[PDB]
Design a protein around this ligand. Structure first.
Ligand SMILES: Nc1ncnc2c1ncn2[C@H]1C[C@H](O)[C@@H](COP(=O)(O)OP(=O)(O)OP(=O)(O)O)O1
Ligand SMILES: Nc1ncnc2c1ncn2[C@H]1C[C@H](O)[C@@H](COP(=O)(O)OP(=O)(O)OP(=O)(O)O)O1
Ligand SMILES: Nc1ncnc2c1ncn2[C@H]1C[C@H](O)[C@@H](COP(=O)(O)OP(=O)(O)OP(=O)(O)O)O1
Ligand SMILES: Nc1ncnc2c1ncn2[C@H]1C[C@H](O)[C@@H](COP(=O)(O)OP(=O)(O)OP(=O)(O)O)O1
Ligand SMILES: [Mg+2]
Ligand SMILES: [Mg+2]
Ligand SMILES: [Mg+2]
Lengths: 484, 479, 481, 480
């Protein structure tokens, strides 16, 4: 019928076009109300109760703001109402594929449960989106508002997941090269500067109790479309380059303080463990009454629709003896009897730990031979080793090298700015790894032992000296001259 | 040692290790799965907050106030023991909340167990006792200098009131300690201060009451042979504003017409599921949603999860309950028709609520209608709005002191403050909704409703002339 | 010339059309950087350092937001870019007439210095605006952007001061654009963008939280026909929010704008200005010299009249300015006139402006019947009378608001108080009376308290809140108390 | 005298001890109400109307919060009420020496007006403090609250300016940590920064990412090389790096905004041209100039942002030139920014050379056709030192930490134990060039000289170099 207004604490009163309202009011979308944005983060930051639902609204809203701003300043781009709606829909829908506790599901659980599969929430989102459209008769409604479902559905999916085919050249079918800038708004594959980040910076900061340093409204006011290598791309004003570096700094701060908090991560790990032990016994009904498992619900969207943070409580409140082991792990979370953090270290020089080796790392720590008297001996299964990749979104690459700028005196001429033209106080590297070790045996003597193994292992591998190394393992740290 | 927790409202809060022990139990952690505002989240998408974080905030603020009083007035002899008991009461006053908070004890239990008299306060005391006993907390209390017999009694009394000086947990010289967590005299307590700031932060509305200011100006003075908390005289304006803010929040958010109808629909689903959902309590015995309040072990497991258990069920027995919840997901909600109030001296009684849909359906609007509606097509929601004390002004039950005589308590009347304040402190709103959502039904529903208002002499609905132009002229009182 | 972006802490990044930039970059406008929004309030709330300049930008911005919103939702209104600019200009320029310390100047100083004259900041704003336009060659620039100076200047002035009888009293725009006159300074009911900026700005600086959401209001606003005018109508649902908006305004007055100490500091500054008024010279047009009290007669002199006068007096060495300087120095040492107490007239009693001068005499004429060391005279008392209302004297402004319903968006309606709530005020205006004493020693203050409470008893005013404590021998004689 | 409560938008309701109230209610302190925190920043960020007065209150408050926190957690430090009050007084009083438009005065005006003198706001503050105490009979009042004026006044001054082997006389080595609260000379981590981060962010419309309340909760005193120092929890090292990053951001975006700086420069110019004619009465009726008022505190007391308006509203023909410059600010006819570059070479341009830089730019010989020829006096060259507060040094190397398992044992954490994503350098210089000739042809020319000069000196390629000077940038192969 007409627009709805929604009050969001981050963006204020947001207007939603009636087509967007139709998409929102479906089981597939409403599911996001039962998925925590930050997963296990809520168990450390009690303000982080927010869910993927409200984040999706914000992304949809901001995507609209940017495409409206570009059209208003540059009418010659011929941005249509159709374009605007398609960008908003992609914005709303890019989080549809998230599973229970968000990054826990595709970052920890699926890789362990279905190692062979290559699953990302992005692929999930496209499949969920297709299911949403077809199950709810949205195509007719799209037609009613001037959309062309064949080309526009393709455009929406491409915004979320990138080109759906091998092109080998313009690889996209939803829109031509003169509308290339539209693909940079929701999920920016070139440099990661998109409206998804801008919403979560402000939303997560508001809920976590941390203040956000990046100003997205400012960026929107200064954004322009310019020709770059025969594409029309979004360009930023030159003098905003400092702010872009700060945006990635902020992202990295948020990961350090919150998203990769050592305890938040161990809770995610414990929940994943419970899910693995429950995976043979939980049944989720999908299409035609068929039953799926937590690990196979990703193969049927009807089942996946019903896969939310509810699984946690279904296990916790179960009485089935088959779920006893899964239930016991979750109960340990309630009593705060967590696996204990031992410490953190990093590889030095060039060392980079591969995913294929993650499984062997607890074995290595347990194989260390600290020269200290120990009452207890620990085994591989008593250790957890978490490897964390921290970067500016593009592996070792500087994403600001993939941004186009313009100057005040020549607004149509795109230019490049190098790091050395900005500041000497910027990072010289853009990627790193952290290694955390935890112990499943929580008593005083086990933990003392775990610390000696860990510090010995760091010494043997030539990793960095843990910050508290001299205090937790005063007999071990002297043997390493590099640390003294 | 102490844990530090980062709360978005209060910042970094320090928690004494005994509080940490109480928090890290199934009975307390349960509050992570209970939305503060129930169905409000379905209208204000920022309101994702749960009872858990609110409880921390209350416990913190209760500590702030008692610490402040002890610091300024050492002669009160506030002990570390007192402080901890007030913080524990603060942490634990929300323990008795059920699924979707006020939906559960405000709508569901009254309909499901009309004979019973249940409040979340009573729930909290029972849950607290169960928490203590199930988790071996008494020894730990002893270890930090608490005396469980007296102090458990003190804590419960802070939450629910007395189970002469009617209290056993502390004597009259510590009377002021009973005003911090749940203030039975006038409702000015740290529970409100936390939810004002927390709800505002999540709802996207700005809070006008400054509790830090209040804490700086609070003193204990003798009032009728009790030591009570007294506010500085100048602060009386801020107190009126505190209640105004509360009433605003209810108007805009807690009693939002759609939030309420969603709570109503969820309640309906729970009623239809109540025969079939089984909750295991003590000794393996099975309970229903409506009887889980009789066993704390079962109640521990009763959270917002029930909603999703019903929604995702495949059992044909749960078909009807599941259908209602699915209507919520598609946003096929019962439609709001309008709102009115009783005029003059009319007050609608709880005993009459059930007859009201019948009355609306019996109205005979003189207009041509395609469809005829029945009682079962109408929902009538009666909402009591007040300043927390029925028709009473709660500021009449506050004690103040002046700068020139800080130990002398005084009273301030409404007329000494402002003529721009309310003359009444309680009122009723009547909302009507229609279960039939099509265009013709809605048209008809509007004519019935306005006719009914006219017949009953209720206030003219705001949009009355637009929704029912043939009906409103017949009433001269309305023009 | 292109658009400038400006970062405001309240509104974020605001875009300004180049014509607005031209108006801003003049002595007449830049003057507002040197005038405190809240006058003496800064001496009580140290966060309130903000000036009229930034407030004006905000008003100009919000006026643009609203007129843009209306044009986007209802293209049939035929709002032109010309209309938008004229509304923004009126928004920017409605504060131009403010004098030193804002409301101190026209609320206290001018009435005392020039009792014969009838001056308001609104009239000041129109005169300043005219002077700004003419002194800076703005008329040609206006023509360059499609404005028609004859009509549009008239329109801008009318937005600020109202019509310069009749169904339609305005000349700048016709009745089909009536809704444009409701944006910047709403004479019908006071619901305008000026309030929305200062609620959010003052709250941000004072450390108080604002409960009115103007962005919400903009989203729900529509233009409808009302009595053959096109007016702005609010959605029916929003009527509660409008009552709250006036409650918030009254809260802010109670807590901040009429703070008892902020007011006494304004009074002291006014006193210093009065004592300096013979000696301070301000050069206006053609080199003529003016006084602080006559600078309002020449805009060139008025342009140079800012909070700077305060410091010019404070730092003076001239013996002629000794008395003015001593008062201000008492402010620095915080040796202020002492607050005695506050009371109200009962029920429906109102004091009027003509009587204000006789009030110190009355207090001094009270005969307490308590033993006193010192006797006080009329000149030792200050009596401040404060009118608190919902912006329209005894009237309910919500009675002058038009609403619309969801089911009939083009049909305007009225909503009465009884259709909203029984918990609303039954009265919309009241007076406070504050008494202060210029003699600050312990014995004088004790005496002042007895006179004051006796006077309250004699006049049948309300019992001061601390009456029993400050005057325990006086309050028993009144059984009603 | 009892405690006063004051409502600050940043900190909320702050309680002030009556002795602090007595210090605040003096001409010497109240003067800070008339001095903008950010100077010419207000002319770019209209929210930045805040003055030094409210910042001083915030610093005094936070200094009290921290010393109270330390005493409460570690009674064995023997912090007295006397210690607390002295730290709060230093906190309140460290801004007393600021002149008109804050950093404009001692960063630009005094160096140009009195090149021979060595003046800082810190020295100003100690002299103002002494004058405040003596003019207002504060010593007796101090005694009344348990202070010992001889030792405590010395302590307060030392906290502000440093020492006038253990070099301090106000307190012994076991109270070393008290000298780290208000102006931390060891590493710059102090409560002054925390207040201005939050205050400036609130007014500028930028959000602050350092949490000082968190830091206070985790701070401890530990023994380090026979001194008792403040130590941070090991975990918090990341937050400290972020604190300095925030400081640098704020300088980049706001404190050193290219236009805010040019406005300060123009105001400085006007002050220079007014300095012979403005008279400020000091002690015994002696007259001082703006540039000599720093020699007499009675005169300096009266030296505030008011000078700006006294000049602007003057009618004296002698002040005509000063008045014209300020009027150009009102009409926004500013000196025009030409561009920004940095040295590539490791030697910092020295303060002694600043004067010769306009001459160098004017001596560049761009190979381009130019209508107009520019002279040295048409160029302004502003050299800006950006660092982490300690020249080339990493201030986190001068921070002590402690671990959860051994809270009294201080440790060091090196940059490599924290992250590879941190800066490799901690100091740099920016060079901004502006032109006093604002017409289109002069500005075109200025751009060619500037880029040519960058090329000749081997400075970095200006960001817009290829657009402003397309004929000049190709000649430098390094720039591609
Ligand atoms: N008074 C208020 N102040 C702030 N937010 C509000 C207020 N009232 C409602 N909201 C929020 C809740 C929603 O997120 C959003 C829309 O609510 P509302 O405008 O009441 O829509 P609605 O759909 O209930 O009304 P209708 O369909 O009658 O327009 O604004
Ligand atoms: N850098 C940060 N900024 C703001 N809040 C943070 C930061 N790091 C953690 N928090 C939040 C999460 C928690 O709510 C609270 C306590 O976290 P933290 O200090 O990490 O406790 P911890 O228990 O993990 O550390 P430990 O047990 O080692 O002392 O602060
Ligand atoms: N990095 C920033 N972050 C937030 N606000 C900023 C930043 N830089 C400047 N501001 C503020 C200050 C001003 O109020 C407003 C305009 O500043 P800026 O965009 O620098 O314009 P400018 O006129 O100085 O540059 P130009 O004229 O080159 O476009 O934004
Ligand atoms: N109602 C309020 N809410 C928030 N801040 C306020 C309020 N009233 C005053 N303030 C601010 C202004 C000052 O910064 C600070 C103290 O003001 P106030 O309490 O009025 O003290 P006062 O000195 O005027 O009263 P007194 O001496 O009578 O105790 O609080
Ligand atoms: Mg609706
Ligand atoms: Mg911990
Ligand atoms: Mg006072």
């Amino acid at each position: 019928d007409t627009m709805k207004v929604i009050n969001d604490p981050i963006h204020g009163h947001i207007e939603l076009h009636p087509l967007l309202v139709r998409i929102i009011d479906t089981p597939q979308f409403q599911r996001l109300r039962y998925i925590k944005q930050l997963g296990g983060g809520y168990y450390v930051f009690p303000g982080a109760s927010h869910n993927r639902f409200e984040h999706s609204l914000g992304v949809g809203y901001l995507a609209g703001c940017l495409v409206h701003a570009l059209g208003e300043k540059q009418p010659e781009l011929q941005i249509s109402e159709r374009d605007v709606l398609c960008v908003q829909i992609a914005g709303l829908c890019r989080n549809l594929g998230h599973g229970p506790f968000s990054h826990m599901f595709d970052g920890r659980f699926i890789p362990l449960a279905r190692p062979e599969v290559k699953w990302t929430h992005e692929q999930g989102s496209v499949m969920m989106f297709e299911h949403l459209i077809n199950s709810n008769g949205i195509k007719p409604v799209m037609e009613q508002y001037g959309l062309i479902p064949e080309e526009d559905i393709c455009f929406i999916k491409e915004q979320i997941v990138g080109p759906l085919e091998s092109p080998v050249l313009w690889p996209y079918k939803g829109r031509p090269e003169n509308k290339s800038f539209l693909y940079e708004i929701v999920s920016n594959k070139r440099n990661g500067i998109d409206v998804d980040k801008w919403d979560y910076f402000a939303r997560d900061c508001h809920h976590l109790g941390i203040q956000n340093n990046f100003d997205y409204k400012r960026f929107i006011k200064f954004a322009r479309v310019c020709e770059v290598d025969n594409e029309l791309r979004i360009c930023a004003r030159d003098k905003e380059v400092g702010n872009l570096y700060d945006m990635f700094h902020t992202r990295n701060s948020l990961h350090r303080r919150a998203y990769q908090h050592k305890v938040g991560n161990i809770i995610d790990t414990m929940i994943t463990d419970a899910f693995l032990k429950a995976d043979d016994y939980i049944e989720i009904t999908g299409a035609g009454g068929k039953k799926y498992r937590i690990s196979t619900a990703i193969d049927d969207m009807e089942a996946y629709t019903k896969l939310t943070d509810n699984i946690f409580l279904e296990i916790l409140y179960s009485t089935d003896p088959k779920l006893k082991d899964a239930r016991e792990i979750l109960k340990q979370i309630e009593y705060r009897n967590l696996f204990k953090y031992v410490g953190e270290t990093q590889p030095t020089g060039q060392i980079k730990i591969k995913r294929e080796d993650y499984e062997s790392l607890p074995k290595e720590v347990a194989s260390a031979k600290p020269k200290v008297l120990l009452d207890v001996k620990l085994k591989a299964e008593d250790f957890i080793v978490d490897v964390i990749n921290m970067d500016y979104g593009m592996q070792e690459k500087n994403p600001i090298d993939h941004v186009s700028f313009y100057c005040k005196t020549a607004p149509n001429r795109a230019i490049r700015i190098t790091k050395n033209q900005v500041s000497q106080l910027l990072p010289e590297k853009f990627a790193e790894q952290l290694i955390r070790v935890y112990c499943k045996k929580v008593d005083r003597k086990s933990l003392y032992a775990a610390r000696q193994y860990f510090v010995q292992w760091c010494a043997d591998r030539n990793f960095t000296k843990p910050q508290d190394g001299d205090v937790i393992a005063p007999l071990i740290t002297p043997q390493k001259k590099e640390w003294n």
